[PDB]
Amino acid sequence: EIVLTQSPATLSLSPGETAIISCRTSQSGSLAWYQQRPGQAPRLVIYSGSTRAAGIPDRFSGSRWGADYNLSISNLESGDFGVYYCQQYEFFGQGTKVQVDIKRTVAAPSVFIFPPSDEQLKSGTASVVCLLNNFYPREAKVQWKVDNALQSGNSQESVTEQDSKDSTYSLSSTLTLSKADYEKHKVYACEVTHQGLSSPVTKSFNRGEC
């Protein structure tokens, strides 16, 4: 079989910059690149290493040095973002996600914590939610503590797309416990680490307090 290895995994850029992504292949052959826009079908961009497909602007160019191929996209446009795959014969790379990140000044998260609802508690489960609102850059760490005991394996986390207008991100983490375990403890804390913070920030509440 042919193995194709792409790098990097993820590329974060602003429109107008140029994207450069690589494919290493395990044998000489005709190598093509495909672009997948979010929720769209892949489209052929370049084939045989450096030949552009129909309707592809010269901003896209591919080059080759032995087993190593580069695909460069100059002057990135909104429509150039997505994931790119290299392909030889029956085989594909694992893909490179080229995504938009626009720089702004660092903005610390605003942290809010929400206890389980009475409605949810009527029914065996308790979800605790911690919100990190409007921060930049994207990298942020959330840790759950119950009575100062570090939690793990019982939370899930989700991040929004970078805001169009203010360029911030937001993150929502959920700690899920059985109602029973939940009523075995008092202090539920969300601890947040971020570049905008001089030091970690904790939002806490005590079970059963109004």
């Binding site: 005709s30 093509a32 795959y85 979800s127």
Partner: protein, 229 residues
């Protein structure tokens, strides 16, 4: 205008089978092989095999041999992909493709100029289920001096997606609806939040509007400050 037309997405349970169809136009169906390629998000695309409409000769990737069958219907320029004994690992978008060079005399299969729009297939043992909507009420633990936060937890639904809005779309500023996460249960859960002036909590009323078409359920939960005497 060469083009490939695909059948829609499907939901399956583990163990079942599925048939997808690809229908061609703008060229002579009998001239070129048709390929099937699946893309699972975050995973390496997998070519499954090709089929030659003229003859019905077939070639499958070793990992699918025994479990997959390709066929065509020359009456309608349609190619079919059938996959048996499904499991969650078969969850992906299924595309049919065609090579760039194709004439009545010759062709070349591997420069995939032409793709169908794709058929999303999810294999899960979960049955479609309307979500539960829970208030994420504001308080002192969500009031940062002058600006507050509240929201809604949309828990345990299947499948994707649900739509969420505030005050029937009236409220849009400061609203963050998050990407759903998949739980052990096999069910989805997501939250939507919105920051507002804590000053407004007293007067303004906030309602989240959740709609989950798959289960044809629609909920409007009012989210207010907990009453403390």
């Amino acid at each position: 205008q060469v083009r490939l037309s695909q059948s829609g997405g499907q939901m399956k349970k583990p163990g079942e089978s599925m048939r997808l169809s690809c229908r061609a136009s703008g060229y002579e169906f009998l001239n070129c092989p048709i390929n099937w390629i699946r893309l699972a998000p975050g995973r390496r695309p997998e070519w499954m095999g090709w089929l030659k409409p003229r003859g019905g000769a077939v070639n499958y990737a070793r990992k699918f041999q025994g479990r997959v069958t390709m066929t065509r219907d020359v009456y309608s320029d349609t190619a079919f992909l059938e996959l048996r004994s499904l499991t969650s690992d078969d969850t992906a978008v299924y595309f049919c493709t065609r090579g760039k060079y194709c004439t009545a005399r010759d062709y070349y299969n591997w420069d995939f100029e032409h793709w169908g729009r794709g058929a999303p297939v999810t294999v899960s043992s979960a049955s479609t289920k309307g979500p539960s909507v829970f208030p994420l009420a504001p308080s002192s633990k969500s009031t940062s001096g002058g600006t507050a936060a509240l929201g809604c937890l949309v828990k345990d639904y299947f499948p994707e997606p649900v739509t969420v809005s505030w005050n029937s779309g009236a409220l849009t500023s400061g609203v963050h609806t998050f990407p759903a996460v998949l739980q052990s249960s096999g069910l989805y859960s997501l939250s939507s939040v919105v920051t507002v002036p804590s000053s407004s909590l007293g007067t303004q009323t906030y309602i989240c509007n959740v709609n989950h078409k798959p289960s044809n359920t629609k909920v409007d939960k009012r989210v207010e400050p907990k009453s403390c005497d």
